[PDB]
């Protein structure tokens, strides 16, 4: 009776708390004359104890009023959300699309009851329009869905990113829509409706008020978060991370293909090697090595292979690391052995080839930039290697008299001392990881000599030891707050954090430059980016990738020049 009162709009009345109203809304047609059009919208009887827009339009085949698309005129921003039937974008569907516009009830597109393309025309224009901001909670999740369903979208403000950056890695939890709204608005949403059934072709009135309020609330969060971002000078990083959403969606939708031939083959190889070692039993070495490399990889990897496409679609995390670097899970691309024997199982698609680029010594160059160390900066500008430079200082030799053994000792000194080791730790570090046999009298000479010449590094280290601060920033002003002071983590953070800024910005510029040649971004790990392109744009994509990374480094570094090592390859092991 009341339960089916609005079945023509595909709505179930679960508690008699929904009325259909019809009123005259003032609009402007493209001819700049005010067309007052009457619209049917829904509203609750029991009013909500807050100020969020809880009314909503619903769009379907039987009530579509084309004049609805006139609310989208001369708008600069709008809240955007979707409701899905599940988490996996390949196995699920978009149930709803909600667009909240300032002062108007939310426009809800009933996707399960729309079969005319002309209805979604006004929608696609808003999504594509680079001049309208779309405010989103979890933009990766929602953009990933829209992209996979042939929706184009540009210009995004993720409230999750703003909230995560404002927290400065002080918390792991508290970044769901419900928590954010309770903190910045003191409103509690009916989160119970997450577990409701979105698969049916009917929705109840409670599901639709949640869909409206969880989209309009974005309009108020944007105003508060936009402001806090500015008061914390986080606009540069927040802008880079928002633009980096689309590249990351690219990397997850594209996935990376696997060559099941060499996978099965190599699997049998390691299996037989394990059997042989078991019979002979060298013991610990070959047995533990082959056992771990077998079970912790050759057996787990097949589980993530898409059965139909032979592709792996990892999950890239944008803001879940301390430094700000990317991380991945299911699978964890940095847990794959860095060996050519194993990495050659990942191949491009048919008629395509990989282009792989890395930075040489970006971390050490960043340290020289932020410390204004003159000897290091002058040496890099003369294209003198930093390990040769340190070898020159330690041995007092001229570059023509420096042998490979000198540069090896210099590598240990540089990586050990720049990041805050003392001479006693340097000895253990050197003998352990480099195979040297230095004495404490030598390492104390290295320590005193290193900081006697690298006066920028010494001033850097000394001031950090003195202030014992808990707040640190990067060159993008990505901020973090330590629970307690740690010398080595304070030195490492600005360096590693700045790498994250440079790589992420490189993916933004790269994602734009690759449209001409329909290039695909595949993966970013450590200091390395991988793209896939058709072989005819091989030589052209090489230049784009290098130029993108170099332009990014140029954005942040003014006194030192990065160096990109690029190579075309058919497999990841090359
Ligand atoms: Cl959420
Ligand atoms: Cl600041
Ligand atoms: Cl911003
Ligand atoms: Cl570099
Ligand atoms: Na969302």
Q: Is 376 exposed, middle or buried (CB count within 10 Å of its CB: 0-12, 13-18, 19+)?
A: buried
* 49 CA distance to ligand 3 middle (Å): 30
Radius of gyration of the chain, Cα coordinates, nearest whole angstrom: 28
Ligand showing the shortest atom-to-Cα distance for residue 527: 4
405: left (phi over 0), alpha (psi -120 to 50) or beta: alpha
CB 479 within 8 A of CB 455: no
CB 438 within 8 A of CB 430: yes
* 44 CA distance to ligand 4 middle (Å): 59
Q: Which of 325, 359, 373 is nearest to 553 (CA)?
A: 359
* 138 CA distance to ligand 1 middle (Å): 7
Using DSSP, state whether 408 is helix, strand or coil: helix
Q: Which of 97, 155, 164 is nearest to 130 (CA)?
A: 155
Q: Method used for this model?
A: X-ray
Q: Cα–Cα distance between 366 and 492 in angstroms, integer?
A: 11
Q: Please name the helix (run of DSSP H) or strand (run of DSSP E) that holds residue 481, with its range, or none.
A: strand 479-481
Q: Cα–Cα distance between 510 and 491 in angstroms, integer?
A: 30
Q: Which of 559, 566, 545, 560 is nearest to 503 (CA)?
A: 545
Q: Which of 280, 176, 165 is nearest to 232 (CA)?
A: 165
* 167 CA distance to ligand 5 middle (Å): 20
* 229 CA distance to ligand 2 middle (Å): 11
Q: Which of 51, 228, 215, 53 is nearest to 135 (CA)?
A: 215
* 99 CA distance to ligand 5 middle (Å): 11
* 483 CA distance to ligand 5 middle (Å): 31
Could you give the C-alpha distances from 459 to 108, 378, 445, in angstroms and in order?
A: 59, 18, 19
Distant-in-sequence, close-in-space partners of 127: CB < 8 Å, separation ≥ 6: 80, 134, 146, 151, 152, 153, 154
Write out the residues surrounding ion ligand 2, Cβ under 5 A.
233
DSSP state of 443: H
Ligand showing the shortest atom-to-Cα distance for residue 239: 3
Could you give the C-alpha distances from 538 to 352, 509, 521, 544, 569, in angstroms and in order?
A: 9, 18, 14, 10, 10
CB 17 within 8 A of CB 205: yes
Q: Cα–Cα distance between 418 and 542 in angstroms, integer?
A: 33
* 195 CA distance to ligand 5 middle (Å): 15
Q: Which two tokens stand for residue 157?
A: 């403000």
CB 218 within 8 A of CB 79: yes
* 142 CA distance to ligand 5 middle (Å): 6
* 161 CA distance to ligand 3 middle (Å): 10
Distant-in-sequence, close-in-space partners of 480: CB < 8 Å, separation ≥ 6: 168, 169, 322, 471, 472, 473, 493, 497
CB 530 within 8 A of CB 523: yes
Q: Return the CATH number at 185.
A: 3.30.420.10
* 108 CA distance to ligand 3 middle (Å): 27
CB 322 within 8 A of CB 169: yes
User: Can you give the resolution of this entry in Å?
Assistant: 2.7
Q: Cα–Cα distance between 508 and 529 in angstroms, integer?
A: 12
Ligand showing the shortest atom-to-Cα distance for residue 145: 5
Which residues share a beta bridge with 110?
96
CA dihedral 80, 85, 90, 96 (to 10 degrees): -30
The distance from CA 421 to its chain's CA centroid, rounded to whole angstroms, is 32
Domain that holds residue 34: 7-253
Q: Please name the helix (run of DSSP H) or strand (run of DSSP E) that holds residue 20, with its range, or none.
A: strand 19-28
How big is the chain, counted in residues? 574
* 87 CA distance to ligand 5 middle (Å): 12
* 180 CA distance to ligand 1 middle (Å): 9
* 20 CA distance to ligand 3 middle (Å): 38
Distant-in-sequence, close-in-space partners of 432: CB < 8 Å, separation ≥ 6: none
* 139 CA distance to ligand 5 middle (Å): 7
């Amino acid at each position: 009776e009341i339960t089916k009162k609005y079945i023509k709009d595909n709505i179930i009345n679960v508690d008699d708390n929904i009325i259909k109203k019809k009123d005259i809304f003032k609009l402007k047609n493209e001819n700049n004359e005010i067309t007052e059009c009457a619209f049917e919208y829904f509203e609750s009887k029991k009013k909500f104890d807050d100020d969020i827009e809880s009314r909503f339009f619903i769009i379907n085949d039987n009530n579509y009023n084309e004049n609805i698309n006139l609310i989208y005129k001369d708008i600069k921003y709008c809240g955007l959300n979707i409701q899905t039937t599940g988490l996996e974008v390949f196995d699920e569907n978009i149930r709803l699309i909600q667009i909240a516009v300032e002062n108007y009830p939310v426009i809800i597109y009933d996707m399960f009851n729309i079969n005319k393309k002309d209805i979604l025309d006004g929608l696609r224009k808003v999504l594509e329009n680079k001049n309208i901001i779309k405010i989103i909670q979890n933009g990766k999740f929602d953009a990933k869905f829209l992209l996979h369903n042939n929706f184009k979208i540009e210009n995004i403000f993720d409230t999750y990113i703003a909230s995560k950056l404002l927290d400065k890695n002080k918390n792991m939890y508290g970044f769901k829509l419900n928590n954010i709204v309770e903190k910045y608005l003191n409103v509690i949403l009916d989160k119970q409706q997450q577990n409701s059934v979105w698969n049916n072709s009917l929705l109840n009135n409670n599901q639709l008020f949640y869909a409206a309020r969880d989209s309009s609330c974005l309009l108020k969060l944007y105003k508060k978060l936009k402001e806090e971002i500015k008061k914390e000078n986080l606009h540069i990083v927040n802008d880079i991370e928002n633009k980096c959403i689309l590249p990351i969606c690219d990397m997850e939708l594209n996935g990376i293909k696997v060559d099941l031939e060499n996978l099965q083959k190599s699997t049998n190889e390691i299996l037989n090697e394990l059997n042989i070692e078991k019979d002979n039993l060298i013991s610990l070495r070959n047995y533990r090595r082959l056992y771990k490399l077998y079970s912790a990889f050759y057996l787990k990897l097949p589980l993530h292979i898409n059965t139909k496409t032979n592709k792996i679609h990892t999950t890239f995390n944008q803001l879940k690391t301390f430094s700000g670097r990317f991380s991945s899970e299911k699978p964890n691309l940095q847990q794959i052995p860095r060996q050519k024997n194993i990495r050659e199982i990942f191949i491009p698609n048919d008629n395509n080839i990989f282009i792989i680029a890395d930075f040489k010594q970006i971390e050490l160059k960043i340290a020289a930039e932020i410390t204004n160390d003159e000897i290091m900066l002058k040496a890099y500008n003369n294209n003198i290697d930093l390990h040769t430079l340190t070898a020159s200082i330690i041995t007092k030799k001229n570059i023509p008299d420096i042998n490979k053994e000198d540069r090896h000792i210099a590598k240990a000194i540089n990586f050990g001392l720049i990041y805050g080791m003392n001479y006693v730790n340097l000895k253990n570090y050197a003998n352990t990881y480099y195979g040297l046999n230095m004495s404490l009298d030598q390492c104390l000479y290295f320590y005193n000599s290193f900081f006697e010449h690298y006066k920028g590094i010494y001033k850097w280290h000394n001031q950090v030891k003195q202030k014992r601060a808990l707040q640190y920033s990067t060159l993008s002003n990505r901020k973090v707050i330590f629970p307690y002071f740690s010398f080595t983590k304070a030195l490492n953070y600005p360096v590693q954090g700045t790498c994250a800024d440079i790589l992420k910005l490189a993916l933004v510029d790269l994602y734009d430059n690759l449209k001409d040649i329909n290039g695909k971004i595949i993966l970013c790990v450590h200091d390395e980016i991988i793209i896939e392109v058709n072989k005819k744009f091989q030589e052209e994509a090489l230049k784009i990738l290098v130029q993108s990374m170099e332009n990014s480094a140029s954005y942040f570094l003014k006194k030192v020049k990065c160096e990109v090592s690029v190579k075309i390859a058919e497999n990841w092991g090359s």
